[PDB]
Design a protein around this nucleic acid. Structure first.
Ligand SMILES: [Mg+2]
Ligand SMILES: [Mg+2]
Ligand SMILES: [Mg+2]
Ligand SMILES: [Mg+2]
Ligand SMILES: [Mg+2]
Ligand SMILES: [Mg+2]
Ligand SMILES: [Mg+2]
Ligand SMILES: [Mg+2]
Ligand SMILES: [Mg+2]
Ligand SMILES: [Mg+2]
Ligand SMILES: [Mg+2]
Ligand SMILES: [Mg+2]
Lengths: 224, 68, 81, 118, 129, 195, 95
RNA sequence: AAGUUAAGGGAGUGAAGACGAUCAGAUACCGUCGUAAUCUUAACCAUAAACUAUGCCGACUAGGUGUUGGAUGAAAGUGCUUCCUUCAGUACCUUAUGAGAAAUCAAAGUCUUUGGGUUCU
RNA sequence: UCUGGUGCCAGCAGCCGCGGUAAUUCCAGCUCCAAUAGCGUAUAUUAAAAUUGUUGCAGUUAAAACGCUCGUAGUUGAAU
C-alpha cells in the first residue's frame, strides 16, 4: 500500500532490496510492521496466501465500585499451509476492534517451521523431523512423526494449528488442564517453534557468514 | 439497557458545547415497547457567532511563523 | 536435508555460534555479529574484514568478552587470551 | 490561586522562542506584540499569555532557562567553552608513581626515562 | 555410596555440555567407561580424551564439540532379545534416522543397528541422541 | 607505544578500586597494601587498538552511538562525536529509545559505546532487544553483562575519561587517511576535560 | 503461605529456647522473639535538673542516669508503636 | 507439658472453689483470697503446630559478605595479634536460555530430552 | 430469537440449568437436524484414566515424610 515506513527494515522491504522473508529470519532481525508480512504474502506473485481464523472470544471483568466492567479477548491463528505459522491475542472493549488487533498481532509473530520424513526420504516432506515438546502454564504437549497415510491424530485445536503450519502426518498426546484454550494454543505454538533449533547430524558442517542487509545496503539507506 | 457508540471528538460543558453541537431525539414503537434514539454531531469547526461571524473554537492559541 | 533425488528441502539454514555451535534460531535477539577490520602493513584500513557470531546464551551469561578474546587470539589478532 | 495551565505556558514559550529580538521587559509593549503575532479570541487569556512572556524574558537575563532553545546563547556558550589553553596540563617533566605501579611498569618491559616514586 | 560409575560419568558429561564448557573432568574411571567413550568417539559426538594415571582408579579429561543433546544410562540392565529391539527404540529414540541405543553383547559393546547386523541380543546400557 | 602509556600514567587510569568482580581478574596486575587494584596498562592499549579497528570497520559514522550519564563525561563524549561522525547523548536517557518505534527519538544504530555499564544500565539493557554489539569501558567492579569488548580503565577520574576518548579518537583518525602516523594529532587534551 | 522466611524469630541449629516475661503485660515469650530496648534516661527534666544544680553542695555535680533494658511481646509492643506495619518489600529491610 | 502411684517438700505461681466488680444477662475477660499441681527420690504413661509442616546415603551445577573451630605461609609485635590460603560447621545478599499453579526455591535444579540406591505415606 | 396454550403450577432436565405474560428448554402445530430397516432405555464391563502409574503419578502450603535413633529378613554395593 501507500504506507510510510518507520524502520530501516521497512524502507528496505518497501523497495525491492530483499527477495525472501527467509533473509530476515537468518539474521534474527525483529519485525515491527505488519506491512512487511503483507508485502511478502500477496494474492499475486505468491503461490500460497495466508488465512485467518477467530478461534476463541472470552469476556473478562474488573468489578469497580459501580458494578463490573466487561471486555473481550480475541485469539486468532494465522497460517500459510506451507512452513509458516503465527498466533496473536488482543484485549479491547468491542469485539470487532479486539479481533482486528489480534489479526495484526498474529502477523508480527510469523515463524518458519521445519518438516521431515518418516522412514526413507522421498519428494515432499510430510511430518515433523523429530519429537518436539511444548509447555505453557500447566499444559504440556508432545508431537511425534507418523507415516504418510495417517492424518493428524489430536484434539480439534491441534488439528487447526498443524493444518495452518503445513504438517500432514502426526501423532500427539497432552497433559495438564487443556480446557484452558490460550495455554493449549501457546503450548502447540511453542512446540512448533522449536523445530529449527535442534542440531541434527546433517547440520554439523560449518559455513561462512553472509552479510547483514544493514551492512550490504548501507549507501542506499544513507541517501535518505 | 443502553448502548453507546462514539467516534472522534466531542465537548460537553460551557458555551461552545451549545454552539458546535447538533442534537435530536426520536422514538420508535416496536412490538414490545418503545426505544429512544439520541444523536449528537459536532460540526466541523463551523459555527457563526452570536455577533454573527464564522468562529472556530474557544480553545486554541496557534502562534504564527515569522516571515523569512 | 537432501531427499533421495538429492534436492535440498530445508527452506533455509540457520547460523551457529562461533564459541559454542548452538544454532541461533529466528527470534533470538541477543545474538550479534562482529566485524574486525584489517590493516595493510602501513596502519591504514583496507576493505577486508573478519567475522564472528555470538549467541544470546553466552552473551547473557557474561562470557562474551573471554570467548571473543580466545577466538581473536586464534586468528593472530591478539597476543593473549 | 494564580497558577497557569499548560496552554498558556506553551503559547508563551513558543512566542519567546520565535520572536526574541523584538520582545522587551515591559508589559504593555509585549501585550501589543502578542496581539499581533498569535491568535487568541479572548483578551483575558491574551493578558495572561503576555504576562508570562514578560516573566520569562526577565528570567533569561540571569542565565539559562530550561525548555527554551535560543541559539545566540548556545553559540555564545560554545565559543566560551572552546577556549584553547596555551599550555597543556597533560605534559609534565616528572611522573610520580606508586611503588607497585613502578614494579608493574618495570616488569612489563616498557621504558620511561623520567619515572620517580615518592 | 556409588553403586554405579557409568551413571555419574554420563551425568557429568551431560551437565557440562548444557553450558558449553569445552572440557570436563571425570573422576572415577573403568574399562566400561572407556568403551562407551570410544563408541561415542566413533560416531563423531566428542573429540579426543586422556587417561590420567594416579596409583588409584584413574581420571579422564575429554574434549567436547558442542554437539551432544543427551546421554544417560538405563539403570536396571534389562535383558533384551533380538526381536524386542523395535519396541525399545520406538520408545526411547527421538527419530528413526538418528540416535543410538547401546547394548552389551556376548560380542562386545555396540549399538542396535550393529546388533541386528550381527544377529545378537544382550542387555541395555544407555543411549545418546 | 611509549608516550601513550606515559600519558596514561600522568592521569590515574591505572588505579581502580576494591570489589574485584572476578570476571575482571585477568586485567588486574596486583592489589596494593591499601586495597586498591592496579590495572595492567598493557592490555588496555591492545584492547583500545582493537576497539578502534572495530569502530572503523563500520561503513558510515552516523550508525554509532556514544552514551554518557554522569556530568564529568559530557564534554569528552560531545567532542569525540564531533571529531568522528557519530551521535552522542550525554544526559538523561529516555527509557524506550531503542525499542519504541513511535517515539520521537527512535534512532536505531549499529554499534553502541558506553562510558560506564553500572550507571548506563538502561542503555545496555535495551541493546539486547535489537542485536546491538555493546562496547564498554570497564573498571575493576563493572558488571560485564551484555558487553562484548571491554577496555579496562577507571571510569571516575575526569582526566582519565578525557584521555581515553582522546586516545580512541586519535587512533581512529590514524586508521583513516586524515593524518599519517609519525606526527602527533595537533588538537590537544583539555578539549575533552570537564569545566 | 509463609509470610516470613525466618518465621518471626532468629533461631537456628537449636531445639528449645527459654522464655522471658513482657515488661508491660506479663506474657511469656521466647527470648529470641521478644523485641528488646535499652534506655539511658535522666532522673528529671532539664529545668528541675538546673534547679538541683544550685541547690547542691560540691559546686560540680552531675545527676546519675537510669539503665532499664525492657522487653515486650508482639501485641504489647506494636500497640505502643515501638514497631509498626510495613509493606511487602520494606519488611525485608533490617537496620 | 499435662496426668496416675508412694514417701518427702511446700516460699512464689495457681485448673477447681468462694467472693467483689462490669453488663440487659456474665457460670468470662479485671480485682481480693485460695485446693490440687508445679520441686526431689523410686515407678508408670508414650502423646504435641514432637515444624525446616521439606526421610536417609552418593555425584554435578554461581558470584559476593560474614561468623564458630583447627592447620599452612607471610607483616606490624613492647614465640602474641592482623593478613593470605585450605578443611569442617552455620547464616545472609544478588542472579539464574533452571524449576514451579503461584507464593517462592542454591534445592523445591540437573524430568515427555521421563530409570544413581533405598524405606514410609 | 416461528406461531398457540400454561403461569414456580403442570412438567422438563445424565450435568450446568428452564418454568411469575417475550418460556429459543413444559404441552401442541409447522419447519429443520442426526442415524436409518432400524432407533431409544436399564444394569455390568473396557478405553477415555499418566484418576493405581514396571513403561508412567503425587507427598513445603492442594490428600500424604513415622517424634528420633539402633536393628534382623529383604533390596542394592569402588577399581584391578
Ligand atoms: Mg467551567
Ligand atoms: Mg520444639
Ligand atoms: Mg503455699
Ligand atoms: Mg494471689
Ligand atoms: Mg502424632
Ligand atoms: Mg508431621
Ligand atoms: Mg513423563
Ligand atoms: Mg476403566
Ligand atoms: Mg489406567
Ligand atoms: Mg493410556
Ligand atoms: Mg494425582
Ligand atoms: Mg521429621
Amino acid at each position: 500500500k501507500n504506507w510510510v515506513p518507520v524502520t530501516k527494515l521497512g524502507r528496505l522491504v518497501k523497495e525491492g532490496k530483499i527477495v525472501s522473508i527467509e533473509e530476515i529470519y537468518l539474521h534474527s532481525l525483529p519485525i515491527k510492521e505488519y506491512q512487511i508480512i503483507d508485502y511478502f504474502f500477496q494474492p499475486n506473485e505468491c503461490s500460497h496466501p495466508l488465512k485467518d481464523d477467530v478461534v476463541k472470544i472470552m469476556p473478562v471483568q474488573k468489578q469497580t465500585r459501580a458494578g463490573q466492567r466487561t471486555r473481550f479477548k480475541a485469539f486468532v491463528a494465522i497460517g500459510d499451509g506451507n512452513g509458516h505459522c503465527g498466533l496473536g491475542v488482543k484485549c479491547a472493549k468491542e469485539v470487532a476492534t479486539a479481533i482486528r488487533g489480534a489479526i495484526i498481532s498474529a502477523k508480527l509473530s510469523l515463524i518458519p517451521v521445519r518438516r521431515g520424513y518418516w522412514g526413507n526420504k522421498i519428494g515432499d516432506p510430510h511430518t515433523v523431523p523429530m519429537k518436539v515438546s511444548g509447555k505453557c502454564g500447566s499444559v504440556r504437549i508432545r508431537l511425534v512423526p507418523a507415516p504418510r497415510g495417517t492424518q493428524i491424530v489430536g484434539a480439534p485445536t491441534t488439528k487447526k494449528m498443524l493444518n495452518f503450519a503445513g504438517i500432514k502426518d502426526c501423532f500427539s498426546s497432552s497433559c495438564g488442564k487443556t480446557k484452558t484454550k490460550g495455554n493449549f494454543l501457546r503450548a502447540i505454538f511453542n512446540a512448533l517453534s522449536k523445530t529449527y533449533g535442534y542440531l541434527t547430524p546433517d547440520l554439523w558442517k560449518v559455513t561462512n557468514f553472509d552479510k547483514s542487509p544493514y551492512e550490504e545496503w548501507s549507501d542506499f539507506l544513507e541517501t535518505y | 439497557k443502553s448502548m453507546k457508540f462514539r467516534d472522534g471528538y466531542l465537548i460537553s460543558t460551557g458555551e461552545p458545547s451549545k454552539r458546535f453541537v447538533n442534537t435530536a431525539t426520536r422514538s420508535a414503537q416496536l412490538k414490545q415497547g418503545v426505544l429512544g434514539i439520541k444523536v449528537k454531531i459536532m460540526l466541523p469547526t463551523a459555527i457563526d457567532t452570536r455577533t454573527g461571524l464564522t468562529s472556530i473554537l474557544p480553545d486554541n492559541i496557534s502562534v504564527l511563523e515569522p516571515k523569512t | 536435508m537432501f531427499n533421495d533425488q538429492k534436492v535440498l528441502v530445508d527452506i533455509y539454514i540457520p547460523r551457529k555460534c562461533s564459541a559454542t555451535s548452538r544454532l541461533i534460531p529466528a527470534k533470538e535477539h541477543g545474538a550479534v555479529q562482529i566485524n574486525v577490520g584489517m590493516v595493510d602493513a602501513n596502519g591504514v584500513y583496507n576493505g577486508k574484514t573478519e567475522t564472528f557470531a555470538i549467541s544470546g546464551h553466552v552473551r547473557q551469561n557474561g562470557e562474551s568478552d573471554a570467548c571473543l578474546n580466545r577466538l581473536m587470539y586464534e586468528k593472530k589478532l591478539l597476543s593473549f587470551q | 490561586g494564580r497558577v497557569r495551565t499548560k496552554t498558556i505556558k506553551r503559547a508563551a514559550r513558543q512566542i519567546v522562542e520565535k520572536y526574541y529580538a523584538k520582545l522587551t521587559l515591559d508589559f504593555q509593549i509585549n501585550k501589543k506584540i502578542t496581539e499581533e503575532v498569535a491568535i487568541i479570541p479572548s483578551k483575558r487569556m491574551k493578558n495572561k499569555v503576555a504576562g508570562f512572556v514578560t516573566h520569562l524574558m526577565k528570567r533569561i537575563q540571569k542565565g539559562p532557562v530550561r525548555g527554551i532553545s535560543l541559539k545566540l546563547q548556545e553559540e555564545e556558550r560554545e565559543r566560551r567553552l572552546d577556549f584553547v589553553p596555551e599550555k597543556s596540563q597533560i605534559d609534565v617533566s616528572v611522573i610520580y608513581v606508586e611503588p607497585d605501579t613502578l614494579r608493574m611498569i618495570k616488569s612489563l618491559g616498557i621504558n620511561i626515562s623520567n619515572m620517580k616514586v615518592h | 555410596v556409588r553403586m554405579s560409575v557409568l551413571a555419574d560419568c554420563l551425568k557429568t558429561i551431560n551437565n557440562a555440555e548444557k553450558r558449553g564448557r569445552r572440557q570436563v573432568l571425570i573422576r572415577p574411571s573403568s574399562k566400561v567407561v572407556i568403551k562407551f567413550l570410544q563408541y561415542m568417539q566413533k560416531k563423531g559426538y566428542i573429540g579426543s580424551f586422556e587417561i590420567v594415571d594416579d596409583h588409584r582408579s584413574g581420571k579422564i579429561v575429554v574434549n567436547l564439540l558442542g554437539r551432544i543433546n543427551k546421554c544417560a544410562v538405563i539403570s536396571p540392565r534389562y535383558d533384551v532379545k533380538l526381536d524386542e529391539i523395535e519396541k525399545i527404540i520406538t520408545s526411547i529414540l527421538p527419530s528413526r534416522l538418528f540416535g543410538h541405543l547401546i547394548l552389551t553383547t556376548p560380542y562386545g559393546i555396540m549399538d542396535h543397528e550393529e546388533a541386528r547386523r550381527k544377529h545378537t541380543g544382550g542387555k541395555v546400557l544407555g543411549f545418546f541422541f | 607505544k611509549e608516550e601513550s602509556i606515559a600519558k596514561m600514567l600522568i592521569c590515574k587510569v591505572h588505579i581502580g578500586t576494591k570489589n574485584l568482580e572476578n570476571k575482571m581478574k585477568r586485567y588486574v596486575y596486583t592489589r596494593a597494601k591499601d586495597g586498591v587494584h592496579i590495572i595492567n596498562l598493557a592490555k588496555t592499549y591492545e584492547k583500545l587498538q582493537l576497539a578502534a579497528r572495530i569502530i572503523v570497520a563500520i561503513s558510515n559514522p552516523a550508525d554509532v552511538v556514544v552514551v554518557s550519564a554522569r556530568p564529568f563525561g559530557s564534554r569528552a563524549v560531545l567532542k569525540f562525536a564531533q571529531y568522528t561522525g557519530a551521535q552522542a547523548i550525554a544526559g538523561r536517557w529516555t527509557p524506550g529509545m531503542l525499542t519504541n518505534q513511535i517515539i520521537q527519538k527512535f534512532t536505531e544504530p549499529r554499534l553502541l559505546i558506553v562510558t560506564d555499564p553500572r550507571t548506563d544500565a538502561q542503555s545496555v539493557k535495551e541493546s539486547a532487544y535489537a542485536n546491538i554489539p555493546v562496547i564498554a569501558l570497564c573498571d575493576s567492579d563493572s558488571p560485564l553483562e551484555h558487553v562484548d569488548i571491554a577496555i579496562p580503565c577507571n571510569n571516575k577520574g575526569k582526566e582519565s575519561i578525557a584521555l581515553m576518548y582522546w586516545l580512541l579518537a586519535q587512533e581512529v583518525l590514524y586508521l583513516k587517511g586524515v593524518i599519517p602516523r609519525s606526527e602527533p594529532w595537533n588538537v590537544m587534551v583539555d578539549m575533552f576535560l570537564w569545566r | 503461605p509463609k509470610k516470613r522466611r525466618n518465621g518471626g524469630r532468629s533461631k537456628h541449629n537449636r531445639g528449645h529456647v527459654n522464655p522471658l516475661r513482657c515488661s508491660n503485660c506479663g506474657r511469656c515469650v521466647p527470648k529470641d522473639k521478644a523485641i528488646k530496648r535499652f534506655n539511658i534516661r535522666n532522673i528529671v527534666d532539664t529545668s528541675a535538673q538546673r534547679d538541683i544544680k544550685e541547690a547542691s553542695v560540691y559546686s560540680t555535680f552531675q545527676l546519675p542516669k537510669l539503665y532499664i533494658k525492657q522487653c515486650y511481646c508482639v501485641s504489647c509492643a506494636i500497640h505502643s508503636r515501638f514497631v509498626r506495619v510495613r509493606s511487602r518489600e520494606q519488611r525485608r529491610v533490617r537496620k
